[PDB]
Amino acid sequence: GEKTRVLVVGGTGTMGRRIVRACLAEGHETYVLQQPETRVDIEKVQLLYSYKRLGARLIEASFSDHQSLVSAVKQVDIVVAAMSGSILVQLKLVEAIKEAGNIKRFLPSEFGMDPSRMGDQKLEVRNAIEAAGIPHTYVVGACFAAYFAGNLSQMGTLIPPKKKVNIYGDGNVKVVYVDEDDIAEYTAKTLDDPRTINKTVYVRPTENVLTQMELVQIWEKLTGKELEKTNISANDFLAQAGLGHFYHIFYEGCLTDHEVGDDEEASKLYPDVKYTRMDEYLKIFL
Amino acid sequence: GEKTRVLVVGGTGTMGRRIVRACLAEGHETYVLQQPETRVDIEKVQLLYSYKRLGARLIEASFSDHQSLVSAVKQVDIVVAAMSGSILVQLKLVEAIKEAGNIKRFLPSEFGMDPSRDQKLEVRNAIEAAGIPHTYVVGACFAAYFAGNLSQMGTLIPPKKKVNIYGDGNVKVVYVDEDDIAEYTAKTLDDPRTINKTVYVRPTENVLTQMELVQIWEKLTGKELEKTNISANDFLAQAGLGHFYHIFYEGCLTDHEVGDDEEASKLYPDVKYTRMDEYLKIFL
Ligand SMILES: NC(=O)C1=CN([C@@H]2O[C@H](COP(=O)(O)OP(=O)(O)OC[C@H]3O[C@@H](n4cnc5c(N)ncnc54)[C@H](OP(=O)(O)O)[C@@H]3O)[C@@H](O)[C@H]2O)C=CC1
Ligand SMILES: NC(=O)C1=CN([C@@H]2O[C@H](COP(=O)(O)OP(=O)(O)OC[C@H]3O[C@@H](n4cnc5c(N)ncnc54)[C@H](OP(=O)(O)O)[C@@H]3O)[C@@H](O)[C@H]2O)C=CC1
Ligand SMILES: COc1cc([C@H]2OC[C@H]3[C@@H]2CO[C@@H]3c2ccc(O)c(OC)c2)ccc1O
Ligand SMILES: COc1cc([C@H]2OC[C@H]3[C@@H]2CO[C@@H]3c2ccc(O)c(OC)c2)ccc1O
């Protein structure tokens, strides 16, 4: 009745699935976009339909069909998108929101490095949102803990090393490690918060701002074993998949080289979210 | 303490993940084989580690490393395999079980058509050559692959206006929720009555023709679907076609009756299996 109605686009994605449940947890009437099947994909289908059992609704639409996008967004108050990074497909979604005219806010697929400090398709999407006058919130500023914490920031894996661990530089650059659930919960709390309309929200829970060497030492403290570390210089690091992102995060320190005010930081805006600290996050791997 | 210890091989698969949960839900001390990551795969890793929260344990081993397989299966009493249907990777698992010597039962990756009427039969023969006690769980169509799409190909959800009927669609088929298959598997793996037996998962009310399946749906929706009957030869004129043919034209799942002592729903009458009118409700 007084629920905010939210449409989640990219609902079976890594972040999308968590945003779906977090909107439900917060009591929003939650709608998930159901795209036509491109394959026989049991996992995707069963995930989408498990949302119905939790109280969500599915709306079939296709980005190839402008009027199906328009009809979907007319049923909701707020749209959140979490596409792969696929980003530019949101342009069709923005066009639909503009025509529909009823959307109180649009959260596009961000949830990572703020692209507007990396001087790119996310900015192209931002520019379209703002040219159309669609109220927005941009959620940025955090490494997914699954991609950067559980592996102690090693590449090619998602679990803790047995023995050996590479340290980028001296491992003294501060990075922001956040459990994707908490990013999704922050997103669900912020999407109808009058304080964040037309703002960028930084997800930087204070106790989770850690250097890589700090994260490794949380883990060494849990296992009681010191890992053999070898440090990698910037030049040697600079000597395909994702190596750039890693450089900005761990050498340039792009996630922590600016300060953020409490009126734009998720953990201060939403203090009741007991976000997962990395000593608790890493326990699953013991 | 008195619990059966079970190693699930294939724990992150469609059937395997349900067997993991169904084993924990039975009270089995449950182990899951953790294979080396072949890629950055976040849904697979997180599924694996979610099992620990429910009480399961992870055992690392690799099929390339015979001794790591022997080491894994020494830690359990029973192994259940649910590999991709790869099936032959189980031959390494059989040699490992044979050398280990401690395993009371092995349930190989079956969960469908009876291959004894094939890679699966080769696994069977190696299991039996090695004298490893076994149970073969067979005889049903996964409901997600065959019921939710009304047995249409290339989709997993109901069609909106038209549907292909195979023949006249009056060949009987066995549609079963994968969770029920997993529950029957978890109940049967330490059941004395099914040692060295085939167990047929043929819940009585879910033995249905494709047309009876379609009519279940039309009745839930109140909408009649436009039907096109496809004859045997026009079908004998793409993955999975041989399977649909044996299921839907020859009735290979239902042409032989099965005794109560070997049919899952009678062995375990406490399993309130999902009937297809309830299964299809989630699509409405
Ligand atoms: N450390 C960090 O901060 C991280 C940041 N991110 C960012 O989070 C956001 C989501 O990333 P992630 O959660 O990993 O996304 P995914 O790879 O999980 O895919 C998400 C959804 O994208 C939809 N999708 C993919 N291609 C298309 C397409 N051509 N047309 C329509 N829909 C498509 C699908 O929606 P559907 O479910 O409907 O099929 C897919 O389910 C991204 O912006 C990413 O840049 C993610 C990784 C780490
Ligand atoms: N309608 C029916 O009756 C159905 C019957 N089946 C049968 O179910 C059984 C399982 O099918 P399904 O659930 O679809 O299996 P999956 O496709 O989901 O994969 C299961 C597991 O196979 C392991 N795997 C795949 N390749 C390898 C490999 N080279 N080496 C080691 N492990 C590998 C992986 O285990 P891991 O988690 O460790 O990574 C994978 O998780 C099969 O026998 C299949 O015939 C399946 C579909 C329908
Ligand atoms: C932190 O913000 C982001 C990070 C990322 C990616 O940075 C590289 C990481 C993460 C997604 O997964 C990338 C990755 C790529 C290759 C890898 O080997 C890897 O670690 C296994 C991780 C993408 C978008 C973002 O907004
Ligand atoms: C029913 O027994 C089995 C069925 C199957 C597969 O037969 C074809 C079916 C099912 C798995 O999904 C296959 C399938 C293949 C192509 C399709 O287009 C399809 O659409 C649902 C479904 C494999 C192993 C079995 O033991």
XYZ file of C-alpha atoms and ligand atoms in Angstrom:
718
model
C 0.000 0.000 0.000
C 2.553 2.548 1.194
C 5.381 0.302 -0.007
C 7.814 1.807 -2.430
C 7.581 -0.302 -5.577
C 10.942 -1.305 -7.025
C 11.823 -2.991 -10.314
C 15.132 -4.864 -10.287
C 16.812 -5.245 -13.673
C 19.515 -7.853 -13.795
C 17.831 -9.779 -10.984
C 19.728 -13.080 -11.446
C 23.147 -11.371 -11.482
C 25.596 -11.509 -8.609
C 24.489 -8.152 -7.191
C 21.020 -8.300 -8.723
C 19.991 -11.407 -6.813
C 21.067 -9.740 -3.561
C 19.301 -6.511 -4.393
C 16.103 -8.484 -5.004
C 16.159 -10.086 -1.574
C 17.227 -6.863 0.133
C 14.315 -4.952 -1.329
C 12.040 -7.722 -0.079
C 13.741 -7.700 3.334
C 13.063 -3.940 3.554
C 9.395 -4.491 2.713
C 9.293 -2.996 -0.752
C 6.872 -4.486 -3.216
C 9.539 -6.010 -5.421
C 9.346 -6.712 -9.158
C 12.095 -8.489 -11.110
C 12.597 -8.127 -14.832
C 12.140 -11.432 -16.662
C 13.990 -11.422 -19.981
C 13.334 -14.054 -22.657
C 15.518 -17.116 -22.378
C 18.575 -17.140 -24.627
C 19.466 -20.732 -23.669
C 18.209 -23.641 -21.595
C 19.433 -22.183 -18.292
C 18.003 -24.050 -15.327
C 19.914 -22.040 -12.714
C 18.716 -18.678 -14.005
C 15.090 -19.813 -14.354
C 14.933 -21.438 -10.956
C 16.524 -18.389 -9.335
C 13.980 -16.050 -10.925
C 11.082 -18.219 -9.814
C 12.402 -18.643 -6.273
C 11.832 -14.876 -5.952
C 8.085 -15.434 -6.383
C 8.029 -17.666 -3.308
C 9.618 -14.845 -1.318
C 6.855 -12.506 -2.471
C 8.345 -10.857 -5.555
C 6.600 -10.493 -8.906
C 8.084 -11.154 -12.323
C 7.503 -8.828 -15.256
C 8.425 -10.148 -18.669
C 10.011 -7.572 -20.929
C 12.748 -7.404 -23.492
C 15.275 -4.630 -24.130
C 14.586 -5.298 -27.831
C 10.956 -4.250 -27.288
C 10.720 -0.642 -26.191
C 7.032 -0.838 -25.307
C 7.615 -3.831 -23.044
C 10.189 -1.772 -21.125
C 7.747 1.118 -20.873
C 4.977 -1.119 -19.539
C 7.199 -2.686 -16.893
C 8.479 0.601 -15.459
C 4.996 2.121 -15.320
C 4.159 -0.425 -12.635
C 6.854 0.695 -10.196
C 8.123 3.780 -8.435
C 11.839 2.984 -8.494
C 14.151 1.102 -10.866
C 17.467 -0.473 -9.852
C 19.698 -2.039 -12.515
C 22.690 -4.340 -11.936
C 23.867 -5.486 -15.370
C 27.100 -7.286 -16.135
C 30.341 -5.384 -16.379
C 25.937 -5.044 -20.834
C 26.094 -1.547 -19.261
C 25.015 0.283 -22.432
C 21.792 -1.718 -22.561
C 20.563 0.626 -19.833
C 20.259 3.318 -22.493
C 17.150 1.521 -23.756
C 15.982 1.350 -20.146
C 16.564 5.087 -19.667
C 14.552 5.844 -22.808
C 11.680 3.812 -21.344
C 11.815 5.595 -17.992
C 11.764 8.999 -19.695
C 8.655 8.047 -21.685
C 6.904 6.356 -18.757
C 7.379 9.461 -16.656
C 6.332 7.905 -13.341
C 9.725 6.804 -12.005
C 10.732 8.636 -8.806
C 14.303 7.370 -8.966
C 16.689 5.251 -11.021
C 19.757 3.494 -9.607
C 21.928 2.362 -12.540
C 24.469 -0.451 -12.547
C 27.383 1.012 -10.624
C 28.426 -0.726 -7.370
C 32.152 -0.383 -8.047
C 34.846 2.171 -8.649
C 33.387 5.597 -9.195
C 33.990 5.817 -12.972
C 33.890 9.634 -12.800
C 37.262 9.670 -10.994
C 39.144 7.378 -13.393
C 40.200 9.927 -16.024
C 33.580 4.718 -20.361
C 30.075 3.247 -20.577
C 28.875 3.942 -17.018
C 29.354 7.680 -17.516
C 27.515 7.462 -20.823
C 24.648 5.939 -18.889
C 24.879 8.639 -16.206
C 24.799 11.348 -18.862
C 21.614 9.880 -20.346
C 19.951 9.636 -16.924
C 20.670 13.268 -16.157
C 19.911 14.643 -19.616
C 16.468 13.050 -19.280
C 15.924 14.535 -15.847
C 15.554 11.154 -14.141
C 16.315 11.450 -10.401
C 19.197 9.172 -9.530
C 21.459 7.683 -6.886
C 24.887 6.288 -7.717
C 26.171 3.626 -5.312
C 29.959 3.339 -5.574
C 33.161 2.903 -3.628
C 33.602 -0.776 -2.622
C 35.420 -3.919 -3.677
C 33.125 -6.939 -3.510
C 34.431 -9.008 -0.637
C 33.997 -12.209 -2.651
C 36.234 -10.955 -5.455
C 38.866 -9.199 -3.274
C 38.710 -10.357 0.371
C 38.094 -14.119 0.382
C 41.128 -14.592 -1.863
C 43.223 -12.050 0.089
C 43.235 -10.014 -3.140
C 44.964 -12.716 -5.198
C 43.898 -13.072 -8.814
C 42.631 -16.231 -10.475
C 41.046 -17.570 -7.291
C 38.333 -16.800 -4.767
C 39.647 -18.657 -1.711
C 42.536 -18.061 0.680
C 45.982 -19.252 -0.391
C 47.535 -22.210 1.387
C 51.081 -20.868 1.640
C 52.054 -18.060 -0.716
C 50.535 -14.627 -1.264
C 51.511 -11.732 -3.499
C 51.530 -8.279 -1.892
C 50.932 -5.397 -4.279
C 53.591 -2.821 -3.575
C 54.106 -2.708 0.165
C 50.471 -3.646 0.809
C 50.024 -0.311 2.590
C 47.420 1.254 0.269
C 43.977 1.433 1.863
C 41.235 -0.510 0.059
C 37.511 -0.830 0.834
C 36.331 -4.441 1.333
C 32.557 -4.873 1.542
C 30.320 -7.899 1.698
C 28.033 -7.759 -1.330
C 25.035 -8.439 0.931
C 25.801 -5.170 2.739
C 26.152 -3.318 -0.550
C 22.732 -4.681 -1.482
C 21.216 -3.764 1.883
C 22.657 -0.247 1.674
C 21.177 -0.014 -1.833
C 17.734 -1.113 -0.638
C 17.794 1.408 2.215
C 19.015 4.291 0.081
C 16.714 4.029 -2.954
C 13.837 5.917 -1.317
C 15.873 7.949 1.183
C 15.185 11.647 0.530
C 18.716 12.442 1.703
C 20.325 10.581 -1.207
C 18.228 11.710 -4.171
C 20.507 12.919 -6.955
C 23.575 11.987 -4.948
C 26.439 9.567 -5.180
C 26.462 7.308 -2.111
C 29.830 5.930 -1.026
C 29.822 2.478 0.574
C 32.836 2.818 2.893
C 32.093 1.145 6.231
C 34.757 2.608 8.462
C 36.205 -0.581 9.926
C 36.435 -2.208 6.488
C 38.910 0.319 5.083
C 42.000 -1.882 5.151
C 45.278 -2.282 3.377
C 45.953 -5.597 1.692
C 48.609 -6.315 4.291
C 46.000 -5.596 6.948
C 43.586 -8.047 5.309
C 46.269 -10.721 5.054
C 47.005 -10.233 8.728
C 43.352 -10.659 9.671
C 43.614 -14.046 7.986
C 46.993 -14.966 9.445
C 45.469 -14.179 12.834
C 42.560 -16.569 12.160
C 44.735 -19.425 10.876
C 47.706 -18.801 13.184
C 50.044 -19.312 10.222
C 52.145 -16.680 8.524
C 52.002 -16.713 4.773
C 55.084 -16.338 2.608
C 54.741 -12.911 0.974
C 56.409 -11.590 -2.161
C 55.858 -7.924 -3.022
C 55.250 -6.819 -6.611
C 56.466 -3.432 -7.813
C 54.308 -1.141 -9.911
C 56.625 -1.555 -12.902
C 56.758 -5.336 -12.577
C 52.995 -5.389 -12.068
C 52.730 -3.210 -15.177
C 55.162 -5.371 -17.183
C 44.514 -9.577 -19.592
C 41.529 -9.956 -17.273
C 41.044 -7.090 -14.815
C 44.698 -6.153 -14.303
C 43.862 -2.461 -14.722
C 41.205 -2.349 -12.014
C 43.665 -4.029 -9.644
C 46.299 -1.396 -10.367
C 44.042 1.570 -9.602
C 42.735 -0.095 -6.440
C 45.974 -1.414 -4.960
C 48.673 0.854 -6.391
C 46.858 4.147 -7.028
C 44.489 3.550 -4.106
C 41.545 5.011 -6.039
C 38.986 3.854 -3.467
C 40.532 5.800 -0.551
C 42.358 8.823 -2.059
C 39.392 11.121 -1.366
C 37.439 11.709 1.788
C 33.660 11.287 1.916
C 31.175 13.029 4.163
C 28.863 11.258 6.563
C 25.879 12.604 4.605
C 27.086 10.648 1.571
C 28.524 7.520 3.254
C 26.346 4.439 3.504
C 27.488 3.220 6.911
C 26.789 6.635 8.444
C 23.540 7.173 6.568
C 22.410 3.668 7.669
C 24.037 2.923 11.029
C 21.676 0.061 11.878
C 23.232 -2.088 9.129
C 25.702 -4.201 11.140
C 27.963 -4.677 8.162
C 30.159 -7.757 8.034
C 33.735 -7.122 9.103
C 36.424 -9.003 7.262
C 37.460 -11.102 10.255
C 33.917 -12.448 10.318
C 33.702 -12.657 6.514
C 36.850 -14.780 6.309
C 35.714 -17.302 8.929
C 33.695 -19.238 6.330
C 36.955 -20.358 4.710
C 38.581 -21.809 7.813
C 27.935 -40.432 16.047
C 25.555 -43.008 14.571
C 25.086 -40.966 11.384
C 26.012 -42.303 7.974
C 28.901 -40.301 6.556
C 28.259 -39.393 2.918
C 30.547 -37.891 0.302
C 28.633 -36.067 -2.432
C 30.614 -35.833 -5.675
C 29.226 -33.194 -7.978
C 27.965 -31.153 -5.038
C 27.462 -27.894 -6.938
C 25.460 -29.410 -9.814
C 21.721 -29.327 -10.371
C 21.075 -32.690 -8.757
C 24.180 -32.613 -6.555
C 23.280 -29.456 -4.636
C 19.896 -30.959 -3.776
C 21.517 -34.206 -2.660
C 23.856 -32.222 -0.393
C 20.892 -30.515 1.261
C 18.763 -33.661 1.323
C 21.606 -35.519 3.053
C 21.935 -32.820 5.720
C 18.157 -32.857 6.124
C 18.264 -36.615 6.746
C 20.842 -36.091 9.468
C 23.709 -37.535 7.476
C 27.172 -36.308 8.327
C 27.678 -34.772 4.920
C 30.905 -34.228 2.983
C 31.254 -32.420 -0.327
C 34.095 -32.947 -2.783
C 35.823 -29.648 -3.526
C 37.595 -29.715 -6.752
C 40.250 -27.184 -7.788
C 38.743 -24.070 -9.312
C 38.884 -24.183 -13.100
C 38.102 -20.454 -13.357
C 36.871 -17.494 -11.334
C 33.384 -18.878 -10.572
C 31.704 -16.981 -7.780
C 28.360 -18.767 -7.759
C 30.068 -22.168 -7.577
C 32.469 -21.173 -4.782
C 29.733 -19.537 -2.750
C 27.394 -22.494 -3.155
C 30.162 -24.780 -1.894
C 30.914 -22.672 1.182
C 27.228 -22.134 1.964
C 27.090 -25.865 2.719
C 29.493 -25.452 5.658
C 27.008 -23.082 7.297
C 24.499 -25.949 7.220
C 26.983 -28.376 8.746
C 28.633 -29.939 5.708
C 32.381 -30.307 5.360
C 34.522 -29.724 2.308
C 37.138 -32.249 1.227
C 39.600 -31.116 -1.408
C 40.664 -33.621 -4.022
C 41.148 -33.850 -7.761
C 40.312 -36.562 -10.271
C 43.790 -36.004 -11.758
C 45.275 -37.028 -8.387
C 44.389 -40.654 -7.661
C 45.744 -40.515 -4.128
C 43.705 -37.434 -3.225
C 40.596 -39.348 -4.258
C 41.570 -42.349 -2.155
C 42.192 -39.959 0.732
C 38.778 -38.296 0.388
C 36.703 -41.482 0.324
C 38.528 -42.987 3.293
C 36.816 -40.267 5.364
C 33.253 -41.375 4.605
C 31.040 -44.452 4.549
C 29.015 -43.793 1.387
C 29.695 -41.862 -1.832
C 27.000 -40.331 -4.030
C 27.985 -39.060 -7.465
C 25.933 -36.667 -9.604
C 28.353 -35.639 -12.358
C 27.431 -33.829 -15.562
C 25.426 -35.855 -18.029
C 32.250 -36.739 -17.548
C 30.217 -39.691 -16.404
C 33.428 -41.590 -17.172
C 35.363 -39.447 -14.682
C 33.683 -41.778 -12.184
C 36.014 -44.603 -13.259
C 38.799 -42.853 -11.352
C 36.368 -42.671 -8.434
C 35.736 -46.425 -8.632
C 39.445 -47.301 -8.577
C 39.842 -44.952 -5.595
C 36.942 -46.607 -3.770
C 38.298 -50.054 -4.648
C 41.747 -49.258 -3.211
C 40.284 -47.503 -0.157
C 38.203 -50.525 0.819
C 36.094 -48.786 3.484
C 33.039 -47.783 1.443
C 29.728 -49.417 2.317
C 27.833 -48.080 -0.710
C 28.410 -46.089 -3.884
C 25.531 -44.436 -5.713
C 26.824 -43.518 -9.194
C 25.502 -40.651 -11.288
C 22.241 -42.016 -12.639
C 19.014 -40.150 -11.824
C 17.304 -40.703 -15.150
C 16.811 -43.211 -17.928
C 17.777 -46.796 -17.200
C 20.964 -47.349 -19.237
C 20.630 -51.137 -19.020
C 17.888 -51.594 -21.621
C 26.520 -45.916 -22.721
C 28.969 -44.285 -20.332
C 26.683 -45.047 -17.381
C 26.627 -48.793 -18.042
C 30.411 -48.775 -18.232
C 30.476 -47.216 -14.784
C 28.022 -49.845 -13.562
C 30.222 -52.665 -14.854
C 33.329 -51.250 -13.163
C 31.438 -50.781 -9.877
C 30.274 -54.377 -10.058
C 33.615 -55.756 -11.235
C 35.189 -54.180 -8.125
C 32.540 -55.710 -5.876
C 31.443 -52.301 -4.557
C 27.908 -52.379 -3.107
C 25.711 -49.993 -5.040
C 22.303 -48.466 -5.512
C 21.050 -47.236 -8.901
C 18.430 -44.455 -8.680
C 16.611 -44.141 -12.001
C 13.318 -43.751 -13.745
C 12.063 -40.167 -13.691
C 12.177 -36.953 -15.705
C 13.440 -33.911 -13.824
C 10.397 -31.703 -13.434
C 12.374 -28.593 -14.370
C 13.469 -30.105 -17.666
C 10.189 -31.765 -18.683
C 7.188 -30.582 -16.659
C 7.568 -26.819 -16.281
C 7.948 -26.389 -20.028
C 5.153 -28.895 -20.739
C 7.895 -31.014 -22.300
C 8.697 -28.467 -24.995
C 12.279 -28.172 -26.117
C 14.498 -25.153 -25.770
C 12.521 -23.526 -22.943
C 12.046 -24.167 -19.243
C 8.762 -22.300 -18.714
C 5.246 -22.918 -19.974
C 4.416 -21.760 -23.504
C 1.904 -19.010 -23.958
C -0.244 -20.144 -26.823
C 1.019 -23.237 -28.682
C 2.486 -26.586 -27.701
C 3.903 -29.582 -29.553
C 2.366 -32.952 -28.630
C 4.532 -36.016 -29.286
C 2.491 -38.529 -31.201
C -0.931 -38.295 -29.643
C 0.763 -37.656 -26.307
C -0.784 -40.651 -24.559
C 2.488 -42.364 -23.675
C 2.946 -42.339 -19.899
C 5.890 -40.379 -18.472
C 7.313 -39.956 -14.961
C 7.553 -36.301 -13.892
C 9.311 -35.702 -10.564
C 10.489 -32.642 -8.665
C 14.265 -32.807 -8.385
C 13.987 -32.166 -4.627
C 11.975 -35.379 -4.251
C 14.550 -37.292 -6.283
C 17.207 -35.961 -3.920
C 15.169 -36.795 -0.810
C 14.550 -40.376 -2.011
C 18.284 -40.646 -2.748
C 19.170 -39.489 0.775
C 16.717 -41.944 2.329
C 17.753 -44.905 0.197
C 21.536 -44.701 0.435
C 21.743 -46.419 3.838
C 18.532 -48.420 3.529
C 19.235 -52.180 3.837
C 16.379 -52.993 1.432
C 18.041 -51.353 -1.586
C 21.596 -52.591 -1.367
C 22.756 -53.737 -4.811
C 19.304 -52.814 -6.144
C 17.879 -50.489 -8.718
C 15.441 -48.033 -7.152
C 12.758 -46.688 -9.497
C 11.541 -43.181 -8.650
C 7.976 -43.529 -9.940
C 5.607 -41.690 -7.595
C 2.217 -43.031 -8.568
C 0.257 -39.832 -9.092
C 3.077 -38.330 -11.205
C 2.929 -41.033 -13.887
C 1.257 -38.941 -16.549
C 1.006 -38.597 -20.283
C 2.213 -35.393 -21.884
C -1.398 -34.646 -22.713
C -2.412 -35.188 -19.080
C 0.412 -32.838 -18.094
C -0.803 -30.227 -20.584
C -4.365 -30.636 -19.343
C -3.203 -30.055 -15.752
C -1.821 -26.707 -16.896
C -4.781 -25.643 -19.059
C -6.957 -26.275 -16.021
C -4.806 -24.107 -13.764
C -4.785 -21.316 -16.387
C -8.307 -21.811 -17.731
C -6.783 -21.406 -21.222
C -6.738 -24.032 -23.977
C -3.449 -24.289 -25.854
C -3.142 -24.784 -29.601
C -1.835 -28.312 -30.127
C 0.250 -29.764 -32.955
C 0.761 -33.522 -32.994
C 4.197 -34.612 -34.208
C 4.392 -38.146 -35.558
C 7.199 -40.587 -34.866
C 8.781 -40.209 -38.307
C 8.483 -36.436 -38.390
C 10.404 -36.583 -35.106
C 12.893 -39.101 -36.502
C 13.368 -36.435 -39.174
C 20.045 -30.611 -31.925
C 20.758 -31.844 -28.411
C 18.480 -34.283 -26.627
C 16.330 -35.594 -29.484
C 17.214 -39.233 -28.832
C 16.127 -38.792 -25.213
C 12.740 -37.214 -25.942
C 12.152 -39.965 -28.487
C 12.782 -42.804 -26.027
C 10.753 -41.060 -23.302
C 7.798 -39.760 -25.266
C 7.342 -42.141 -28.204
C 8.632 -45.438 -26.775
C 7.557 -44.848 -23.151
C 10.847 -46.192 -21.807
C 10.102 -44.771 -18.341
C 6.809 -46.645 -17.924
C 6.678 -49.741 -20.126
C 7.838 -52.095 -17.349
C 5.925 -52.220 -14.106
C 7.917 -51.971 -10.890
C 7.384 -53.671 -7.567
C 6.740 -51.947 -4.276
C 10.026 -53.267 -2.895
C 11.938 -51.281 -5.550
C 9.881 -48.127 -6.138
C 10.819 -45.044 -4.178
C 7.400 -43.732 -3.275
C 6.419 -47.039 -1.646
C 9.809 -47.645 -0.029
C 9.525 -44.202 1.531
C 5.819 -43.338 1.795
C 6.561 -40.487 4.206
C 7.935 -38.372 1.317
C 4.970 -36.147 0.396
C 6.218 -35.738 -3.146
C 5.163 -32.729 -5.204
C 2.364 -33.492 -7.631
C 2.492 -31.630 -10.920
C -0.576 -29.476 -10.257
C 1.353 -28.034 -7.324
C 4.674 -27.968 -9.215
C 3.230 -25.875 -12.035
C 1.587 -23.327 -9.723
C 4.817 -21.331 -9.414
C 4.559 -20.394 -13.111
C 1.047 -18.971 -12.980
N 34.191 -5.292 -6.547
C 33.033 -4.610 -7.085
O 32.555 -3.591 -6.720
C 32.343 -5.224 -8.238
C 31.493 -4.304 -9.062
N 30.582 -4.941 -9.913
C 29.668 -4.154 -10.691
O 28.195 -4.623 -10.150
C 27.375 -4.555 -11.193
C 26.776 -5.977 -11.527
O 27.887 -6.769 -11.742
P 27.477 -8.356 -11.582
O 26.662 -8.342 -10.282
O 28.866 -8.986 -11.436
O 26.631 -8.721 -12.921
P 26.301 -10.178 -13.719
O 27.447 -10.718 -14.567
O 25.803 -10.972 -12.548
O 24.986 -10.146 -14.651
C 23.983 -9.367 -14.087
C 22.733 -9.315 -15.044
O 23.070 -8.806 -16.218
C 21.861 -9.152 -17.252
N 22.527 -9.175 -18.521
C 23.740 -9.539 -18.964
N 23.795 -9.259 -20.304
C 22.560 -8.728 -20.635
C 22.123 -8.291 -21.819
N 22.796 -8.231 -23.098
N 20.908 -7.828 -22.020
C 20.082 -7.778 -20.919
N 20.536 -8.222 -19.709
C 21.781 -8.680 -19.572
C 21.461 -10.281 -16.838
O 20.155 -9.918 -16.214
P 19.086 -11.109 -15.933
O 19.364 -11.692 -14.547
O 17.750 -10.450 -16.138
O 19.296 -12.136 -16.961
C 22.430 -10.645 -15.684
O 21.603 -11.507 -14.956
C 28.257 -4.161 -12.383
O 28.209 -2.809 -12.509
C 29.689 -4.420 -11.980
O 30.384 -3.396 -12.874
C 30.607 -6.370 -10.013
C 31.903 -7.172 -9.672
C 32.820 -6.609 -8.562
N 15.398 -35.616 -16.377
C 16.352 -36.413 -15.681
O 16.095 -37.493 -15.165
C 17.702 -35.835 -15.661
C 18.853 -36.756 -15.448
N 20.132 -36.165 -15.322
C 21.294 -36.898 -14.865
O 21.718 -36.245 -13.474
C 22.995 -36.507 -13.298
C 23.552 -35.130 -13.000
O 23.097 -34.364 -14.072
P 23.274 -32.792 -13.588
O 22.522 -32.506 -12.277
O 22.483 -32.131 -14.724
O 24.854 -32.557 -13.478
P 25.551 -31.056 -13.744
O 25.662 -30.467 -15.151
O 24.858 -29.998 -13.014
O 27.119 -31.036 -13.254
C 27.296 -31.846 -12.111
C 28.780 -31.903 -11.627
O 29.595 -32.434 -12.522
C 31.074 -32.145 -12.000
N 31.768 -32.135 -13.264
C 31.482 -31.802 -14.539
N 32.566 -32.085 -15.300
C 33.520 -32.580 -14.434
C 34.763 -33.003 -14.674
N 35.517 -33.101 -15.906
N 35.583 -33.450 -13.735
C 35.105 -33.505 -12.454
N 33.816 -33.066 -12.210
C 33.043 -32.613 -13.197
C 30.934 -30.979 -11.458
O 30.954 -31.167 -9.998
P 31.420 -30.015 -8.991
O 30.255 -29.389 -8.225
O 32.453 -30.613 -8.048
O 32.137 -28.781 -9.469
C 29.458 -30.578 -11.713
O 29.164 -29.746 -10.639
C 23.499 -37.013 -14.641
O 23.582 -38.390 -14.544
C 22.336 -36.709 -15.594
O 22.124 -37.752 -16.652
C 20.290 -34.775 -15.602
C 19.236 -33.926 -16.305
C 17.800 -34.464 -16.357
C 35.867 -2.505 -7.527
O 35.031 -2.113 -8.558
C 34.971 -2.951 -9.602
C 35.796 -4.051 -9.738
C 35.649 -4.867 -10.850
C 36.449 -5.951 -11.136
O 37.746 -5.572 -10.810
C 38.491 -6.684 -11.131
C 37.699 -7.738 -10.486
C 36.314 -7.102 -10.272
C 35.427 -8.043 -10.918
O 36.247 -9.169 -10.988
C 37.418 -8.690 -11.495
C 38.384 -9.693 -11.511
C 38.963 -10.044 -12.722
C 39.906 -11.044 -12.831
C 40.277 -11.705 -11.688
O 41.200 -12.673 -11.738
C 39.703 -11.369 -10.469
O 40.100 -12.019 -9.366
C 39.936 -13.397 -9.470
C 38.767 -10.366 -10.376
C 34.724 -4.560 -11.815
C 33.895 -3.477 -11.684
C 34.032 -2.681 -10.582
O 33.225 -1.622 -10.474
C 15.130 -38.278 -18.338
O 16.396 -38.847 -18.243
C 17.387 -38.059 -18.688
C 17.178 -36.937 -19.473
C 18.247 -36.162 -19.893
C 18.155 -35.049 -20.733
O 17.460 -35.500 -21.834
C 17.154 -34.403 -22.624
C 16.747 -33.390 -21.667
C 17.285 -33.919 -20.316
C 18.107 -32.820 -19.828
O 17.696 -31.727 -20.586
C 17.607 -32.231 -21.891
C 17.114 -31.262 -22.796
C 17.811 -31.115 -23.975
C 17.468 -30.187 -24.923
C 16.397 -29.384 -24.690
O 16.073 -28.490 -25.621
C 15.674 -29.479 -23.517
O 14.634 -28.641 -23.371
C 13.998 -28.734 -22.144
C 16.040 -30.429 -22.577
C 19.513 -36.555 -19.540
C 19.740 -37.652 -18.772
C 18.681 -38.404 -18.360
O 18.924 -39.467 -17.599
